[PDB]
Ligand binder design. Structure first.
Ligand SMILES: c1ccc(SCCN2CCOCC2)cc1
Length: 460
C-alpha cells in the first residue's frame, strides 16, 4: 500500500450564533452553495482530513462530534477517526481523518490563546491543532477575533498575540512561531473584519449583493486592505472571494441581512461583511492548491453562514536510509556562499544564525557575522563564505530536495531572534551555486531579509 504524495484537506469555519445546528449540514462538507464549489462528481470521495472550526458553539464536544461523524458517514460511508478536539469557551476545533491515516498521524498537539486584558479578556481567542502526517507537519488555527467595524486594529493585535503565544508543533524550533513551524498552516475562523463603507450605504450594499457584484464591496473589506498594507497575515494567501457576505443574516432564511443597530448589538451596525475566512501559508515550493472556497446557502440556524475551503496539499513519506536517521550521510551537504542579512533594527549587537531542519540531527549555530551600514541607513550582517557546512541525515535527492531550512538571526548579546525565515531545498540544480532568498519576520512582522547562494550535494 503506497504512501501518498498528496492529500486533500477540508477546512470549515462556522459561527453558530449560540444555536444548535439544523438536522442536515452535509452541504458544508460537500462544498456546495455560493463561491468556488466542488464538482458533484466528487461527492462520494472523502477528503483525507476534515478540520472544523466553530465559534459561538453551544454544543458539548460529544454532541458536536456525534453530528460531525454521522454527517461524514452519511456522505462517504466512511467512519472517520477523531484526531483531536479542543475548545476554549465557545471556540472549538475538531480534526477528523480517514481510518487508513491513523498510523500516518503522530505528534498531535493542541493549544489555545485568550486575547485581550480585563474588559476584553473573556470570550475571544483561538484554538489550534498540529500533527505530523508522515514527513509533513500540518498546523490549524481557528480564531474568533474582536468584533465591531471600528476595531480592525484590535483584530490585528489579536492576530499577533495568537501567532506569538499559540504553542503548537515542534518545541525544539524555539526561535520560530507557528508561522514557520509547519509545512502547511491553515488559519481560519470568525476573523470579524468588515466591509468599511458608510452606514448610510447599507441598502446600496444589499443591492450589490443581490446582483452578485462584489468588487466594490471587496475593495473595502478590512482584511484585504489590512493585508495589502502589511498590517496583518503577512505572507499568508486567501483564495478569491466569489460568495456573498456571510454575516449578518436574519436567522431561518438567507433572504435578509440584519444590519441595523439594536440593543442586542450594543447599538452597533453590522453592515454585510465577510467575517468568516480561510487563509493559509505553506513553505516555499510545496504543492498547495485551493479547490473550493465558498459558503453554504441552506444552513440558516445562525446569523452567519458556514464557510468551506478545500485544498490539495503535498505530503512526503517518513524516509529511512541505511545511514540516517541516527547518523549523517557523508554523500550529502548544504553550503551557503556570499550570504548576508539586511535588518531593520536600529540596534548594534553582533548577530549569528541558527539553521533548523528535520534533515539535520540538530540545529546548527554559525559564527558571528560582520556588521556594515547599508547605503539607505540599514544594518547589513555579512556572513561571506563563513557559514558552517550542513550535514543532512539522508543524501538521497528524492528526500533532500523536498526539505526546508529555517533560519533565525539572533543577537549575540541576548540570544533573542531578530528575524526568522525559510529556504526551500527544491533547487533547479545540485552541485551548482544558486541564489536563495527569504524575508525575515519576528512576531510575524517584517524585520529584514536573508539572501545569498546555496550549493546542495545529494547522492546523485
Ligand atoms: C492582500 C491583497 C493583495 C496582495 S498581493 C501579494 C499576494 N501574495 C500574498 C502572499 O504571497 C505572495 C504575494 C496581498 C495582500
Amino acid at each position: 500500500q503506497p504512501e501518498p504524495d498528496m492529500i486533500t484537506i477540508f477546512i470549515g469555519t462556522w459561527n453558530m450564533g449560540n444555536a444548535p445546528p439544523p438536522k442536515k449540514i452535509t452541504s458544508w462538507f460537500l462544498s456546495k452553495g455560493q463561491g468556488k464549489t466542488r464538482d458533484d462528481s466528487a461527492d462520494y470521495i472523502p477528503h483525507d482530513i476534515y478540520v472544523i472550526g466553530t465559534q459561538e458553539d453551544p454544543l458539548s464536544e460529544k454532541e458536536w462530534l456525534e453530528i460531525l461523524k454521522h454527517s461524514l458517514q452519511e456522505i462517504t460511508s466512511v467512519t472517520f477517526k477523531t484526531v483531536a478536539i479542543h475548545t476554549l469557551w465557545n471556540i472549538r476545533i475538531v480534526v477528523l481523518a480517514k481510518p487508513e491515516h491513523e498510523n500516518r498521524i503522530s505528534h498531535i498537539c493542541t493549544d489555545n490563546v485568550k486575547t485581550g486584558i480585563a474588559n476584553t479578556l473573556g470570550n475571544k481567542g483561538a484554538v489550534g491543532v498540529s500533527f505530523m502526517f508522515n514527513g509533513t507537519s500540518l498546523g490549524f488555527v481557528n480564531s474568533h477575533l474582536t468584533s465591531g467595524s471600528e476595531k480592525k486594529l484590535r483584530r490585528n493585535q489579536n492576530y499577533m498575540n495568537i501567532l506569538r503565544f499559540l504553542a503548537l508543533g515542534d518545541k525544539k524550533l524555539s526561535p520560530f512561531n507557528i508561522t514557520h513551524r509547519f509545512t502547511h498552516l491553515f488559519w481560519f475562523g470568525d476573523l470579524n473584519y468588515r466591509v468599511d463603507l458608510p452606514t448610510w450605504e447599507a441598502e446600496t450594499i444589499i443591492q450589490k449583493i443581490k446582483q452578485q457584484q462584489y468588487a466594490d464591496l471587496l475593495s473595502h473589506d478590512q482584511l484585504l486592505t489590512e493585508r495589502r498594507e502589511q498590517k496583518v497575515f503577512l505572507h499568508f494567501e486567501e483564495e478569491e472571494i466569489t460568495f456573498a457576505p456571510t454575516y449578518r443574516f436574519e436567522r431561518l432564511t438567507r433572504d435578509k441581512y440584519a444590519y441595523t443597530k439594536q440593543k442586542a448589538t450594543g447599538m452597533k451596525y453590522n453592515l454585510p461583511s465577510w467575517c468568516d475566512r480561510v487563509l493559509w501559508k505553506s513553505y516555499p515550493l510545496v504543492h498547495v492548491v485551493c479547490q473550493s472556497y465558498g459558503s453554504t446557502s441552506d444552513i440558516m440556524t445562525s446569523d452567519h453562514s458556514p464557510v468551506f475551503a478545500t485544498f490539495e496539499a503535498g505530503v512526503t513519506s517518513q524516509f529511512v536510509s541505511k545511514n540516517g536517521p541516527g547518523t549523517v550521510d557523508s554523500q550529502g551537504q548544504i553550503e551557503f556562499l556570499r550570504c548576508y542579512a539586511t535588518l531593520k533594527t536600529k540596534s548594534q549587537t553582533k548577530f549569528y544564525l541558527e539553521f533548523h531542519s528535520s534533515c539535520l540531527e540538530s540545529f546548527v549555530k554559525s559564527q558571528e557575522g560582520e556588521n556594515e551600514e547599508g547605503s539607505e541607513g540599514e544594518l547589513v550582517v555579512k556572513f561571506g563564505e563563513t557559514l558552517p557546512k550542513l550535514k543532512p541525515i539522508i543524501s538521497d535527492p528524492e528526500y533532500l530536495l523536498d526539505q526546508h531550512i529555517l533560519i533565525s538571526i539572533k543577537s549575540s548579546d541576548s540570544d533573542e531572534s531578530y528575524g526568522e525565515g525559510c529556504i526551500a531545498l527544491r533547487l533547479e540544480a545540485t552541485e551548482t551555486q544558486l541564489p536563495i532568498y527569504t524575508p525575515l519576520t519576528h512576531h510575524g512582522e517584517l524585520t529584514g531579509h536573508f539572501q545569498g547562494e546555496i550549493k546542495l550535494q545529494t547522492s546523485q
